[PDB]
Design a protein around this ligand. Structure first.
Ligand SMILES: O=C(Nc1cc(Cl)cc(Cl)c1)[C@H]1CCCC[C@H]1C(=O)O
Lengths: 104, 306, 147
């Protein structure tokens, strides 16, 4: 501390500096989108969303050929929308924790 | 537990300060300390050795791997016994004997590798680990590569020539592990860190993540065996034993692709790394067995007329 | 079959207040001056384990019924792709367990958990989407095999 006569810890969340500056703010790390550590989930999620939308629009425009019949139709659309949501979970995780994001 | 802090000063009046809890008392006026991995004497009269820690035979982190290893070893013993004393059928006799018994031998060696792994690591058990964790996979994937090479050729071939192919593929891994043992001497396993003198382990002294190099050859084996298992998917052999080989190769590749990074990341912690080693070896053996010999075993037990 | 899950999450939404906090900064000893707090979105791991165990049991039932569907003929049978998906998902959701729980002793860059989750999830999805629908689009878009 700046205490000349009896030195003491700076509190939690507030870094020291044994110089004239006094204690200082601790750096706070977030999973910001600019991080190289988030580009892998970003890329995987975006390619998964693209694939899911492609399969959705393929069934939607081929909704009558016997192989989409064999796929069970709308139960398969429920499955594939579930995959879409499971992908969007990744987009939701990398965002700032905030309050609503942690709930979702 | 305390030393007289010095101040010659005006008069010989001392202060008292307790030593660093890992620093003992060899002089009344100054503490003393010894190397990392060590500890102070109770009366602080010298250096003392903290007792070595390792994954023990009966601890909670080895019970699971040892159980899966023993169950798989017994299953492999049963499989080989059936394939030996009930081999008269063409499903085994015309697609087996010692060739494709190499598969069962490799599976048995893989299963016993978990037994080998959870033991006293300071001694030559390091050498056994370094040789075997490679050779056990080498046997299985080399014999699988021999099978898929033959099927691709029919898609020289002879029983002794198939044995020679397997032996040469094995000798490659044997030579690479011999070269590694030349690079790094085995044994002398112990170490700790600046952090503590209160936590010590007998982790093997071979450099961390080096054994992946020994596994590189195995990876190459997979990288070939999958490819040929692809190219030979159209040919129905005895009970169409091709689709099964492709299934086995895909499952083994799936296991490997996650197992390698898992080891590399978990190398920070010895417990999880060793448990992962045992679980991955057991899983590879189990998937090889239940993807290749499971259909043949079903045919020769539940359809004996074939 | 989703009801028990829904109940589940609501139960967590009354058992766990779902509050975010700046992590108390023992991720590194603050004495070495360059110490960090990773602002962890504090969701208890027990809820994650419970939800994933529910999905594991659900997929075990899926595998059981896929095995029982062995005798289904022609295009209505997809037991083998389903089994492949289940094997891949089990391997994924096991390779997840040691990094997220075991490696988490490594205090440095604890947010490797986040990726270890997200990547794993989007891989499992990339399997269920792939091995179940790519061998179903490849025809409709390439092969006019059927009327
Ligand atoms: O796994 C995590 N979050 C989480 C995500 C989902 Cl989708 C579900 C649940 Cl139960 C938890 C990590 C990464 C985010 C903050 C810190 C850590 C945590 O354990 O909360």
């Amino acid at each position: 501390q700046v205490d000349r006569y009896t030195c003491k810890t700076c509190p939690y969340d507030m870094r020291p500096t044994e110089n004239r500056t006094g204690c200082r703010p601790i750096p706070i790390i977030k999973l910001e989108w600019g991080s190289p550590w988030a580009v892998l989930p970003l890329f995987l999620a975006v390619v998964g969303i693209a694939a899911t939308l492609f399969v959705v629009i393929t069934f939607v425009r081929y909704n009558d050929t016997p192989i989409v019949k064999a796929s069970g139709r709308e139960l398969s659309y429920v499955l594939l929308a579930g995959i879409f949501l499971c992908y969007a979970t990744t987009f939701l995780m990398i965002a700032e924790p905030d309050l609503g994001t942690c709930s979702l | 537990n305390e030393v007289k802090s010095v101040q010659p000063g005006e008069v010989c009046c001392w202060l008292c300060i307790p030593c660093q809890p890992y620093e003992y008392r060899l002089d009344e006026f100054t503490c003393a300390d010894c190397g990392l991995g060590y500890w102070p004497n109770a009366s602080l009269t010298g250096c003392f050795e903290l007792p070595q820690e390792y994954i023990r035979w009966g601890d909670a982190w080895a019970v699971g791997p040892v159980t899966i290893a023993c169950l798989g070893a017994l299953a492999t013993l049963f499989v080989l016994g059936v394939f030996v004393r009930h081999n008269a059928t063409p499903v085994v006799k015309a697609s087996g004997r010692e060739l494709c018994y190499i598969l069962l031998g490799g599976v048995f060696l893989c299963y016993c590798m978990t037994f080998i792994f959870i033991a006293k690591p300071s001694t030559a058990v390091c050498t056994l680990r370094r040789l075997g964790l490679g050779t056990a996979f080498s046997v299985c994937y080399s014999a699988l590569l021999t099978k898929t090479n033959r099927i691709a050729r029919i898609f020289f071939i002879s029983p002794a020539s198939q044995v020679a192919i397997c032996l040469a593929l094995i000798s490659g891994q044997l030579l690479i592990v011999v070269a590694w043992l030349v690079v790094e001497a085995p044994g002398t396993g112990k170490e700790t860190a600046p952090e503590r003198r209160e936590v010590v382990t007998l982790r093997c002294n071979h450099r961390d993540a080096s054994m992946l190099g020994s596994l590189a050859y195995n990876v190459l084996l997979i990288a070939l065996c999958t490819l040929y298992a692809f190219k030979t998917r159209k040919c129905p052999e005895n009970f169409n034993e091709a689709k099964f080989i492709g299934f086995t190769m895909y499952t083994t590749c799936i296991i490997w692709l996650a197992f390698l990074p898992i080891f590399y990341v978990t190398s920070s912690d010895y417990r999880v790394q060793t448990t992962t080693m045992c679980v991955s070896v057991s899983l590879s053996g189990s998937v090889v067995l239940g993807c290749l010999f499971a259909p043949k075993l079903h045919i020769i037990l539940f359809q004996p007329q074939k | 079959l989703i009801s028990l899950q829904l109940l589940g999450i609501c139960v967590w939404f009354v058992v766990d207040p779902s509050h975010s906090v700046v992590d108390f900064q023992d991720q590194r000893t603050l004495d070495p001056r360059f110490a960090r707090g990773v602002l962890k979105c504090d969701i208890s791991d027990l809820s994650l384990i419970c939800l994933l165990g529910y999905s594991m049991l659900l997929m075990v039932t899926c595998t059981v019924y896929a095995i029982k569907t062995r005798g289904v003929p022609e295009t209505f049978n997809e037991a083998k792709p389903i089994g492949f998906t289940m094997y891949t998902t089990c391997i994924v959701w096991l390779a997840f367990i040691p990094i997220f729980f075991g490696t988490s002793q490594s205090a440095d860059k604890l947010y490797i958990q986040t990726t270890t989750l997200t990547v794993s999830v989007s891989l499992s999805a990339s399997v269920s989407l792939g091995m179940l629908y790519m061998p179903k689009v490849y025809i409709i878009l390439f092969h006019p095999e059927q009327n």
